[PDB]
């Protein structure tokens, strides 16, 4: 019941690729006596003053739980980060999606290498296609949107597919 700090990710993707950048933001209160913020990764201290924490080039070991605190805003609930290996990754900002909420997906390439002829698939079927990599944005989620999703695109002269992700439409 003591007030808590809150972690936010910028960008909001919690699944990222190696070499991606991640900014972690701490929402918490300060006072004239202390304006410091502490960051924890897997419950170990990684930063003791600055409000934000920047991961320049993510490694697999940067996966795990992140928490922050200020003196007035106590240790946040953890926020989970997954750093994956590979060339293509279907990114999502959160795990569960309620009906009528938007579904925002991105076919993300390693180092943001340019992607052409991009398909997002649901349960094995082409759902949306772009000649130039765009995000997948379902404005209003219906329960028919649940399924196994992956994406695929042409890198020069070689097609690559991401691994599948389970998208669940809840209430």
């Amino acid at each position: 019941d003591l007030p808590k700090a809150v972690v936010f990710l910028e960008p909001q993707w919690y699944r990222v690729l190696e070499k991606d950048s991640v900014t972690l933001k701490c929402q918490g209160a300060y006072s004239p006596e202390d304006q410091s913020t502490q960051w924890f990764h897997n419950e170990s201290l990684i930063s003791s003053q600055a409000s934000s924490y920047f991961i320049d080039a993510a490694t697999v070991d940067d996966s795990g739980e992140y928490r922050c605190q200020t003196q007035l805003s106590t240790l946040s609930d953890p926020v989970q980060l997954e750093v994956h290996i590979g060339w293509l990754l279907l990114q999502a900002p959160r795990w569960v999606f309620k009906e009528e909420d938007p579904i925002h997906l991105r076919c993300h390439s390693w180092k943001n290498t340019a992607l052409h002829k991009v398909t997002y698939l649901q349960n094995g079927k082409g759902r949306k296609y772009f000649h130039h990599n765009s995000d997948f944005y379902i404005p209003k989620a219906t329960l028919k949107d649940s399924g196994s999703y992956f994406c695929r695109g042409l890198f020069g002269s070689k097609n690559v597919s991401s691994e599948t992700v389970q998208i669940t439409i809840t209430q």
Partner: antibody
Framework: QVTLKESGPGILQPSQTLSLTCSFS??????????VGWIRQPSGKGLEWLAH???????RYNPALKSRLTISKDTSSNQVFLKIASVDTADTATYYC??????????WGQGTLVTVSA | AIVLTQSPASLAVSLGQRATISCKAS???????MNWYQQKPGQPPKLLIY???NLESGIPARFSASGSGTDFTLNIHPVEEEDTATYYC?????????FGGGTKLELKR
């Protein structure tokens, strides 16, 4: 970390079959996006891409080297092989293998000279 | 098949000056998978720039590159003694992968 070392016979006679081996470390050809390619360079000349093999066994070949080229891989032993058939003097060159990905060539090996002569 | 032509074919450069190498592609593809490699006489090529403008880690920032359609430009500034080498552009945009013919950079003293 990532290193590649080519091996050949040094010398082989014309019309024979060139066997080249690339042994690598620091990555695995099972990882999505990884490939191994072969490039050659006649002395004092430019570079000519020959062939490469992807992690999913997709194989691409220079359409000017007829059908003499055959590339294979071995995931267990971290090796890739290139066979050139019906060699002649114009095949003499340094042969490089390289770890590539769909957008660029990342690491090259030291290269091995192959002379085609009797 | 994409033809890459480098200009000049050879350059003599003074210590500390900017050196520019152009690589012109016969075909335009809307970043393009244009790569640059440095090859010192005894050694393999070594990656300098990947995907038109990205500096490979461990390479000094006096190497840089930019693309303007079919017009790709490598820039070395300042030029140092150890830059004497041949520089190659290369495209992975389409099969078959092709290289430029090379630009041979030599130092003055």
């Amino acid at each position: 970390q990532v290193t590649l070392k080519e091996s050949g016979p040094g010398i082989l006679q014309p019309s024979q079959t060139l066997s080249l081996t690339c042994s690598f470390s620091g990555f695995s050809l099972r990882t999505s996006g990884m490939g191994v390619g072969w490039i050659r360079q006649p002395s004092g000349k430019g570079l000519e891409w020959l062939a490469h093999i992807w992690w999913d066994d997709d194989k691409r070949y220079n359409p000017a080297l007829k059908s003499r080229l055959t590339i294979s891989k071995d995931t267990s032993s971290n090796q890739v092989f290139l066979k050139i058939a019906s060699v002649d003097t114009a095949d003499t060159a340094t042969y490089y293998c390289a770890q590539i990905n769909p957008a660029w060539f990342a690491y090259w090996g030291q290269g091995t000279l192959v002379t085609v002569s009797a | 098949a994409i033809v890459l032509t480098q200009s000049p074919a050879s350059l003599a450069v003074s210590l500390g000056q900017r050196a520019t190498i152009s690589c012109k592609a016969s075909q335009s593809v809307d970043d393009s998978f244009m790569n640059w490699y440095q090859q010192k006489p005894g050694q393999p090529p070594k990656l300098l720039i990947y995907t038109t403008s990205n500096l490979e880690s461990g390479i000094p920032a006096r190497f840089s590159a930019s693309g303007s359609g079919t017009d790709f430009t490598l820039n070395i500034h300042p030029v140092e003694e150890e830059d004497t080498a041949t520089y190659y552009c290369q495209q992975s945009n389409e099969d078959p992968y092709t290289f430029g013919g090379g630009t041979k950079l030599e130092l003055k003293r």
